[PDB]
């Protein structure tokens, strides 16, 4: 049953599984003080008596893996790479590492020192680890752990992050994209409520592949949940498309401007129906960002798009592939 099985000691070592399973276990120097037999196997979900429970839009995105010896404690983190088979990109849904100590309860896996610290974690090892970006394209998740639980598995779910804003007001920023901000004035909401400001970056390489040089784009910014009215106008700040930061084609105000503000109001997980709302609200430019207001939660999307009549068509082609 073992996809990987090898001896390692204080000097560390690694092993890949067959190209059909894509597992990789990397045990850095100094993590394993005594000689130990590192193994990994797949676990059929039928054999679990209590499989991970799943809400409506949650699913397992990888094989369940049992790393051996179970309960192995390491002196500093080790690395496991596992392919995933999620049917989506990084918009409304996220991938998370789950673990089960004995197969009965499933909880999110914690790592105190993650991707930022990879160079330290390798402890001078002569191996390469790909970047997040390369891992994303190859559809591989990297697990950083100081121990082997009975099971690990990757889960797809709706993004769980949120902040609470009340009638006193406040601001939200995004986890991933730093300049994306929303400002809620004093009576925007009547009571204390969960909100997210969800910024999805748009990679140049994908825009270039699908659209060439016909347009660039800002990140997509969604105020969640959608289908809510605000009682005061909420202030949004979105970073400009890269080609506008560099040199704007025009003043970017009123109606014929090639800087288009797109909006989608519909509900649904990774659903959008884009409308060009350029010059129905006023945009103010500063610190490489556009600033405008909305009375409704929605998706917003800026595009520097000279052929202005094609902006919605381009956004649609692009969004389907994000
Ligand atoms: Na995501």
From Swiss-Prot:
The modification Phosphotyrosine is found at residue 162. The modification Phosphoserine is found at residue 171. Residues 2-157, 159-305 form the ZU5 domain. The modification Phosphothreonine is found at residue 50. Regulated by phosphorylation. Isoform Mu17, isoform Mu18, isoform Mu19 and isoform Mu20 are expressed in skeletal muscle. Isoform Br21 is expressed in brain. Component of the ankyrin-1 complex, a multiprotein complex involved in the stability and shape of the erythrocyte membrane. Attaches integral membrane proteins to cytoskeletal elements; binds to the erythrocyte membrane protein band 4.2, to Na-K ATPase, to the lymphocyte membrane protein GP85, and to the cytoskeletal proteins fodrin, tubulin, vimentin and desmin. Erythrocyte ankyrins also link spectrin (beta chain) to the cytoplasmic domain of the erythrocytes anion exchange protein; they retain most or all of these binding functions. Component of the ankyrin-1 complex in the erythrocyte, composed of ANK1, RHCE, RHAG, SLC4A1, EPB42, GYPA, GYPB and AQP1. Interacts with a number of integral membrane proteins and cytoskeletal proteins. Interacts (via N-terminus) with SPTB/spectrin (beta chain). Also interacts with TTN/titin. Isoform Mu17 interacts with OBSCN isoform 3/obscurin. Interacts with HIF1AN. Interacts (via ANK 1-5 repeats) with RHCE; this interaction mediates the primary membrane attachment site for ANK1. Interacts (via ANK 1-2 repeats) with AQP1 (via the N-terminal). Interacts (via ANK 1-13 repeats) with EPB42. The 55 kDa regulatory domain is involved in regulating binding of SPTB/spectrin (beta chain) and SLC4A1/erythrocyte membrane protein band 3. The ANK repeat region forms a spiral around a large central cavity and is involved in binding of ion transporters. Adopts a T-shaped arrangement, in the ankyrin-1 complex, in which ANK 1-5 repeats are orthogonal to ANK 6-24 repeats, with the peptide binding groove of ANK 1-5 repeats oriented toward the membrane. The rearrangement of the ANK 1-5 repeats orients the canonical protein binding groove to directly face the membrane, to interact the membrane-embedded targets RHCE and AQP1. It is linked to Spherocytosis 1: A form of spherocytosis, a hematologic disorder leading to chronic hemolytic anemia and characterized by numerous abnormally shaped erythrocytes which are generally spheroidal. SPH1 is characterized by severe hemolytic anemia. Inheritance can be autosomal dominant or autosomal recessive. Patients with homozygous mutations have a more severe disorder. This is Ankyrin-1. It comes from Homo sapiens (Human).
């Amino acid at each position: 049953g073992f996809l990987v099985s090898f001896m390692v000691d204080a000097r560390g070592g690694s092993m890949r599984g067959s190209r059909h399973n894509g597992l990789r276990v990397v045990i850095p120097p100094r993590t394993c003080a005594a000689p130990t037999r590192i193994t990994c196997r797949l676990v059929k979900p039928q054999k679990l008596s209590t499989p991970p429970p799943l809400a409506e839009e949650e699913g397992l995105a990888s094989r369940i893996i049992a790393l051996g010896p179970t309960g192995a404690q390491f002196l500093s983190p080790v690395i496991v790479e596992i392919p995933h088979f999620a049917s989506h990109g990084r918009g409304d849904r996220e991938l998370v590492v789950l673990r089960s100590e004995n197969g009965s309860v499933w909880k999110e896996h914690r790592s105190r020192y993650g991707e930022s610290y990879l160079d330290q974690i390798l402890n001078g090892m002569d191996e390469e680890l790909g970047s997040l970006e390369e891992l994303e394209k190859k559809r591989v998740c990297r697990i950083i752990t100081t121990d082997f639980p009975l099971y690990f598995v990757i889960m797809s779910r709706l993004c769980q992050d949120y902040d609470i804003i009340g009638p006193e007001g406040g601001s939200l920023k995004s986890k991933l994209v730093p300049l994306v901000q929303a400002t809620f004035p004093e009576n925007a909401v009547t009571k204390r409520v969960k909100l997210a400001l969800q910024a999805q970056p748009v990679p140049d390489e994908l825009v270039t592949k699908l659209l060439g040089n016909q347009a660039t784009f800002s990140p997509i910014v969604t105020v969640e949940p959608r289908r809510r009215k605000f009682h005061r106008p909420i202030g949004l700040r979105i970073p400009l498309p890269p080609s506008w930061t560099d040199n704007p084609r025009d003043s970017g105000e009123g109606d014929t401007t090639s800087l288009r503000l797109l909006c989608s109001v519909i509900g649904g997980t990774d659903q959008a129906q884009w409308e060009d709302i350029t010059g129905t609200t006023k945009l103010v430019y500063a610190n490489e960002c556009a600033n405008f207001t909305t009375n409704v939660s929605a998706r917003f999307w800026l595009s520097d798009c000279p052929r202005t009549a094609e902006a919605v068509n381009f956004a649609t082609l692009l969004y389907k592939e994000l």
